[PDB]
Amino acid sequence: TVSAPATYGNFVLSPENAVTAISYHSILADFNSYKAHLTSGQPHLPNDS
Amino acid sequence: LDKILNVEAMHTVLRALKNTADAMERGLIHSFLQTLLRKAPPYFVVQTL
Q1: What is the DSSP string of chain A?
Q2: Does B36 touch chain A if contact means CB atoms closer than 8 Å?
Q3: HSE on the CB side for A13, CA within 13 Å?
Q4: Closest chain A CA to residue B3
C-alpha cells in the first residue's frame, strides 16, 4: 500500500515577482528569500521552491 | 500578475475616454473658429464699406 500524494502542488507568484516580471521579464523563485539571505549573509537555502 | 492587466485595461479605457472628450471640446472650438473665418471679410472690405 503506497502512500502516494493526493493532490497537485501549486506555485503562487510573489508580489515582488510581479515587478521583475514586468521590468525584466524574469522571475527568480522566492525573491523575498534571497533578500533575507543576502542580508543575513547565509549561503545555503533550506529548499529551492 | 493578472490583476495588473485587469487594472491597466480600465486605465487605458479611462484615458481613451478623457482624451476623446477633450478632443471634442477642442474640435468645437476649432469649428467655431472655422465658421468665423468663413464669415469674416478682410479689413479693407469692411473699411471701404
Answers
A1: ------S----PPPTTHHHHHHHSS---S-HHHHHHHHHHT----S---
A2: no
A3: 13
A4: A18
